[PDB]
From a paper:
Here we identify and characterise a sub-family of multi-centre photoreceptors, termed photocobilins, that use B12 and biliverdin (BV) to sense light across the visible spectrum. We have identified and characterised two types of photocobilins, one from Saccharothrix syringae (SasPcob) that represents a standalone photocobilin photoreceptor and a more complex protein that consists of a photocobilin diguanylate cyclase (DGC) fusion from Acidimicrobiaceae bacterium (AbDPcob) that is representative of a photocobilin domain fused to an enzyme domain. Crystal structures reveal close juxtaposition of the B12 and BV chromophores, an arrangement that facilitates optical coupling.
The adenosine binding pocket is strikingly similar, with the ribose moiety stacking with the conserved Trp61 residue and forming a network of polar interactions linking across the dimer interface via the conserved Glu71-His72 motif. In SasPcob, the BV is bound with a ZZZ configuration, with Asp270 forming key interactions with the co-planar A, B and C pyrrole rings. The D ring is positioned out of the ABC plane by approximately 40° due to close interactions with Trp296. In SasPcob, the close interaction and relative position of the B12- and BV-binding domains brings the two chromophores in close proximity, with the edge of the BV C and D rings within van der Waal’s distance of the conserved Trp61 and the corrin ring B, respectively. Furthermore, a direct hydrogen bond is formed between one of the corrin ring B amide groups and the BV ring D. This likely explains the B12 allosteric effects on BV affinity observed in solution.
Author numbering:
A (entry chain A): 7 to 214, 224 to 345
B (entry chain B): 7 to 214, 225 to 345
């Protein structure tokens, strides 16, 4: 189709950092009868996933991604400066979770909803619940749409969703943070999930008590201890650490913290496949940057030792180690 | 003065969270002969400062600011989808420092440069030097334009500017992070500063050391110093005793920020950085029902620990004097 050609031309503009070409392409596609929603979901969204794949593989830098993403935002704005219908359906507030800076997925949702006649107030990146809740109380929208892209944000998602529901505002949720097929929204009972902006719009067209886990609490309270334990194990087993400068040591510490935090998220939703997928993803990220993924196994074994009398955490760690071992046999 | 009226109408749209009205206003102003640069600098920029004032005073929430800022971004895009000239002058890369997420000031610079015929690649928020440097080596732009809004980022700015210069790329710098009249850029010799997008464009139209041990100590001992501040608050500041996890975390975050701004102040050896930060902090906290006297408690505790660091000691003294003076009026 013209969509194959459109994707190639769009990626070429994004890779070149050429905002005018990307926007002009989008406008010409609209002029030729390509639906706005198709430009946003089949062209822009698809390009952004691929940019992520390239970054993950260390084939693109952060600068290259940033250039592209900013242009994709301009494409989304240009397309919405044309496809938006007069607001006749009601009012939706679109917000990212506190600590969630992937605004572009949420912007696509906002634009698609506007195209169907919703009045949308877009709040975008990182809205604290303490500020979002009074905003919902102030304006009483028909729905709040909460976007989460990182599964590590799932504990926060659960809290923010609960707080929003307590205002009586219907909650829609989405983004990659709930998993590609919405699994972690369903596990949490977190609002109504949908996979895409199109599906969100379809939902809106219809005629329509959580005890703390001490094991999760321990992963938060003992984070520094666990990072330190991982580092000490790397000191014993992983030779490159001995020659790391400040920058590489800081990256190691950052990554160790992220390992603990994803383990915490996995335990929170009690789905070991969160930690499993995280560990295999981490292996790919590190390998692509010349860091042996065996380093991860060293850290996981060390954390498992410290927490071996925490049965749920132990199970998740075991699952992570098995997933890594399986990944590394290729 | 259509600009007085324009400002009122714009702020009304922003306060209402009405993107269509704000964009339509901008377009009507352009249609009536208001220069694009005027819409961006005299209307949009001015509104964003005022949103900052309202937030600082706890009169606007984060949600209210976020709604407004996203609309201002759409105004900037709409105005640039009209005012940008064909690229004929050369190539500028526009980037925020690593850890700097105020992209909008940099977007205004980008749009104004495009209006003067520059090809601009906008990288926006938070670009690590390790990624920016190879990008500059790859593309050899005529300049890189670095934006910094938070003075706490100044030590990083100094390093990133040096790294960019080492690629042979001329560096322009700006944003609030370089201080009043660019003072902190100028004392460091960190690139060529300019106050506004207009002035940046004007510059482009022309024919063109030992590590700091006191700074190092403020970074290395950050946790210790936060803890010292907290222990003093425990001894002297009654509300802390009744704080839940959330308020305790906010206290800890703020104490860290106090240390980090002290580090920046010492780094550029300008006590007025720390002084202005402390008085700003007092206003922020007071507006949220937290006694600014709490800040004095923390500062006195940090001064005790670091009393044999002469530069740091001086900056802390200056901060305490600035706070005392602020609190008598
Ligand atoms: C651009 C980008 C960034 C940008 C985003 C800026 C912006 N303006 O949004 C920046 C640079 C800020 C960024 C930062 C980071 N990111 Co990033 N980034 C991306 C990237 C490449 C594209 C995102 C995008 O544009 N999505 C647009 C399209 C693709 O979204 P979409 O899913 O089709 O959207 C639909 C659905 O999600 C759904 N939906 C979404 N929200 C909602 C809400 C509701 C209510 C409903 C019903 C539906 C719904 O409907 C949408 C529209 O149809 C992705 C790759 C990816 N696969 O997403 C990563 C990716 C998400 N990032 C990733 C990472 C790791 C990071 C960082 C941690 C990196 C770092 N160390 O700094 C940080 C974290 C920042 C934070 N705290 O959030 C990883 C996350 C992997 C993981 N471990 O979970 C990814 C997946 C890349 C990868 N590794 O392959 N990132
Ligand atoms: C919008 C906003 C945000 C948004 C920004 C999103 C975005 N898309 O940019 C978000 C929510 C992300 C944000 C976050 C925060 N912010 Co804020 N925010 C603002 C606000 C209200 C407006 C910024 C803006 O739109 N500027 C547009 C206009 C006003 O910029 P301008 O100065 O006119 O731009 C010109 C010049 O600076 C110059 N220039 C700028 N860059 C360059 C570069 C070059 C090369 C040149 C030549 C010139 C140049 O030319 C420009 C164009 O003419 C300001 C208020 C303010 N006074 O700026 C604060 C403000 C900057 N934020 C502030 C704070 C404290 C924060 C947070 C720390 C809050 C928090 N705890 O989360 C974080 C920090 C995030 C980070 N790490 O960077 C404070 C900082 C005070 C301080 N201590 O330094 C301010 C001053 C608000 C206040 N207190 O009054 N913020
Ligand atoms: C357990 C052992 C372990 C070690 C030894 C480790 C080290 C490590 N990680 C690095 C980078 C990195 N590591 C990550 C990983 C992540 N980014 C994210 O946002 C998330 C969630 C992850 C995953 C945990 C990334 C993306 C970089 C590259 C940083 C950059 O942009 O330059 C680097 C720098 C690479 C270089 O400069 O050569 C080192 C040394 N990480 C580890 O986990
Ligand atoms: C020394 C004593 C000291 C104390 C006791 C302190 C406490 C403190 N600061 C708070 C919020 C806050 N404190 C800040 C301050 C900042 N935000 C920034 O980005 C920066 C740089 C600052 C300044 C340091 C802000 C903006 C909030 C509001 C956070 C929110 O909205 O949740 C709160 C929560 C208020 C409430 O919910 O009732 C407390 C308790 N801060 C202190 O510094
Ligand atoms: C998911 C996206 O996050 C971006 N990314 C990775 N590390 C950083 C960083 N330190 N600062 C800003 N953006 C970053 C990458 O460009 C990636 O594509
Ligand atoms: C400078 C701007 O930073 C925003 N701001 C303050 N705290 C947060 C936060 N936790 N998350 C996101 N934005 C925030 C405010 O809305 C302010 O206006």
């Amino acid at each position: 189709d013209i969509l194959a050609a459109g994707r190639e031309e769009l990626m070429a503009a994004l890779a070149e950092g050429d905002e005018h070409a990307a926007v002009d392409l989008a406008m010409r596609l609209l002029d030729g009868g390509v639906p706005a929603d198709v430009v946003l979901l089949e062209l822009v969204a698809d390009a952004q996933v691929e940019i992520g794949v390239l970054w993950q593989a260390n084939r693109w830098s952060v600068a290259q991604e940033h250039a592209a993403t900013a242009i994709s935002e301009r494409v989304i704005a240009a397309v919405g400066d044309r496809a938006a219908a007069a607001p006749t359906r009601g009012h939706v507030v679109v917000a990212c979770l506190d600590g969630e800076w992937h605004a572009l997925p949420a912007r696509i949702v906002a634009e698609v909803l506007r195209g169907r006649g919703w009045r949308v107030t877009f709040l975008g990146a990182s809205v604290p619940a303490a500020h979002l809740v009074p905003y919902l109380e102030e304006h009483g929208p028909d729905a709040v749409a909460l976007s989460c892209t990182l599964p590590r944000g799932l504990p926060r998602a659960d809290q923010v969703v609960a707080a929003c529901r307590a205002t009586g505002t219907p909650v829609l949720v989405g983004g990659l943070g709930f998993g590609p097929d919405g699994r972690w929204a369903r596990v949490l009972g977190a609002g109504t999930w949908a996979p895409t902006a199109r599906a969100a719009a379809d939902l809106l067209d219809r005629p329509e008590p959580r005890p703390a886990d001490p094991e999760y609490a321990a992963l938060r309270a003992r984070r520094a201890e666990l990072v330190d334990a991982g580092l000490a194990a790397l000191h014993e087993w992983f030779p490159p650490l001995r020659d790391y400068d400040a920058r590489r040591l800081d990256a190691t510490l950052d990554d160790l913290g992220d390992i603990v935090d994803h383990l915490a998220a996995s335990v929170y939703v009690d789905d070991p496949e969160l930690f499993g997928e995280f560990v295999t993803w981490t292996a790919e990220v590190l390998a692509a940057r010349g860091v042996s993924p065996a380093s991860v196994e060293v850290a996981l074994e060390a954390i498992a030792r410290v927490l071996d009398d925490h049965p749920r955490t132990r199970h998740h760690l075991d699952h992570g180690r098995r997933a890594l071992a399986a990944h590394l046999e290729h």
